Design a protein around this ligand. Structure first.
Ligand code: ZN
Ligand code: ZN
Ligand code: ZN
Lengths: 309, 69, 93, 32, 45
């Protein structure tokens, strides 16, 4: 739909298409690998310039105004005043303001840079759409952060996000479902999800939960095996992954005889003690299938160390 | 880091006298000057080879092995 | 004590050797006790007020950032380590 | 040596220096 | 395939492109690539 304006390097003498071309960076020459004829000379390499990412900000070149080695406050104040009174940049400033708040929210929870980059990208892709017009901005930011965490394999829980961003679960759930649909819609248009996108992904929660309790890495590995094998029981498979992980952690806590009571485990992870004990009864009947064979074989942990009711 | 095999100047073999030199200092109660002469190191080119050597190998051996068999 | 929090949210003790290899910052956490008090009084017009405690005095530890720790300092792990301990930690005496 | 009140020599000053570096070190100012 | 070595407990591991970079025994996150098994020639000069 436009002029070609394409340059293809081919050897006139050899005429073989496609041609074998070797780029001698050291000698600054492009030479035909067959006859040795030089096709182009004085090749350039591939401060005075700035690199910006055209995925979170697109094409938006702007320059700030600030004090120099000599400057009067009058000019700086009025010049900044004039810059603010622009109509073209107002539309993009809202998106930029959203990124600033997302960065502050992400930086207040001690999350990696990848999450905020993913969260900002998710916001931009799903922003400026007719579907997301009746939802609070807080819900949109929280949903984007949750999506960003999922893409980084460090997915958090709904409660963890709700601790910082205050939005009722109904709006949170509806926004997330809408946001996922938008990503799917734009994925087919031109990916987005993988095995990690699955909601449960319980294995990711165990390392953090045990860390909060201060358990050793050996206990964490045993809990991971227990949780992975915990999905074979139908009576527990339909339970929430948080309860599955916490109860699995509790079983390993008593297996290794750590002096930590359930009253504090549920207080730290915000899980009802009755639910932990209620799930323990179901999980107590399948203990033989929920213990790593190697750990019992070595002798570190025995099935007789688990109290029975 | 470890005792040189040969004297730098004249090429005399001095790498087989490090343990003897240490033994003379410790058990024989000899000063470094007498121990060097008893080992047959007469030219001062050879004397400085053993006299000024620093055994850094012992310090390195304190670290646990990176790859144990 | 010096510590590092990973991407998944697991926090563990950080030693200088690991920090050098992992391109991490050798720093510890800072916590401060925060007391939140609220006073109210009936502001009768044209009179000085007498604020009174309204039985709401909350009093928890708040994280306020990380402070880089100088090696071989009172807050570093190598201050209480003997020569053998340093060799175990792959640190030069 | 023989008397606990005899004057010291210039060679005995190095013992004082050795004590100084045993307590302080070479990077005492940075750590302190 | 490839065999790695933990940098804290000296445990030999085997990792794939999908496996997470971490020791499964002690939990360390620093791994050393194992010495190549192919002979290497050296000149004694
Ligand atoms: Zn050609
Ligand atoms: Zn010699
Ligand atoms: Zn290990």
């Amino acid at each position: 739909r436009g002029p070609n304006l394409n340059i293809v390097l081919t050897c006139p003498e050899c005429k073989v298409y496609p041609p074998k071309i070797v780029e001698r960076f050291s000698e600054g020459d492009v030479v035909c690998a067959l006859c040795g004829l030089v096709l182009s000379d004085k090749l350039v390499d591939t401060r005075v310039g700035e690199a910006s990412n055209p995925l979170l900000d697109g094409n938006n070149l702007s320059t700030r105004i600030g004090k120099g080695e000599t400057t009067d406050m009058r000019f700086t104040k009025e010049l900044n005043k004039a810059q603010g009174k622009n109509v073209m940049d107002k539309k993009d400033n809202e998106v930029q303001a959203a990124f600033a708040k997302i960065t502050m929210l992400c930086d207040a929870a001690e999350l990696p840079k990848i999450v905020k980059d993913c969260a900002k990208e998710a916001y931009k892709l799903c922003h400026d759409e007719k579907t997301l017009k009746g939802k609070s901005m807080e819900s949109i930011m929280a949903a984007s952060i949750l999506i960003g965490c999922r893409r980084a394999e460090v997915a958090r829980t709904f409660k963890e996000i709700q601790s910082l961003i205050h939005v009722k679960t109904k709006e949170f759930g509806k926004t997330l479902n809408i946001m996922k649909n938008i990503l799917r819609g734009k994925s087919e248009d031109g990916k987005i999800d993988t095995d990690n996108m699955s909601g449960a992904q319980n294995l990711t929660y165990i390392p953090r939960f045990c860390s909060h309790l201060g358990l050793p890495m050996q206990v964490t590995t045993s809990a991971e095996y227990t949780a992975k094998k915990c999905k074979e029981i139908k009576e527990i498979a339909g339970k929430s992954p948080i309860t599955i992980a916490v109860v699995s952690i509790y079983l390993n806590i008593l297996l290794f005889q750590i002096p930590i009571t359930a009253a504090k485990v549920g207080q730290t992870l915000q899980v009802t003690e009755g639910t932990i004990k209620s799930g323990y009864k179901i999980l107590y009947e399948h203990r033989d299938k929920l213990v790593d064979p190697q750990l019992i074989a070595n002798g570190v942990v025995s099935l007789d160390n688990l109290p029975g009711v | 880091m470890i005792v040189p095999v040969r004297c730098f100047s004249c090429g005399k073999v001095v790498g087989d006298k490090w343990e003897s030199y240490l033994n003379l200092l410790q058990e024989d109660e000899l000063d470094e000057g007498t121990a060097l002469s008893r080992l047959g190191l007469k030219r001062y080119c050879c004397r400085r080879m053993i006299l000024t050597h620093v055994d850094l190998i012992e310090k390195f051996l304190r670290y646990n092995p990176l790859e144990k068999r | 004590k010096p510590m590092v929090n990973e991407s998944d949210g697991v926090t563990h003790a950080l030693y200088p050797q690991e920090a050098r290899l992992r391109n991490l910052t050798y720093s510890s956490g800072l916590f401060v006790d925060v007391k939140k008090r609220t006073y109210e009084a009936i502001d009768v017009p044209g009179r000085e007020l007498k604020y009174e405690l309204i039985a709401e005095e909350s009093e928890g530890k708040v994280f306020i950032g990380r402070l880089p720790i100088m090696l071989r300092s009172k807050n570093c792990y190598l201050s209480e380590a003997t020569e053998s301990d340093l060799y175990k930690l792959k640190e030069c005496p | 040596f023989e008397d606990e009140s005899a004057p010291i020599t210039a060679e005995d000053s190095w013992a004082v220096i050795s004590a100084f570096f045993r307590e302080k070190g070479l990077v005492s100012q940075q750590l302190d | 395939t490839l065999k790695y070595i933990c940098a804290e407990c000296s445990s030999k591991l085997s990792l794939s492109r999908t496996d997470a970079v971490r020791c499964k025994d002690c939990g360390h996150r620093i791994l050393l690539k194992a010495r190549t098994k192919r002979l290497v020639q050296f000149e004694a000069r």
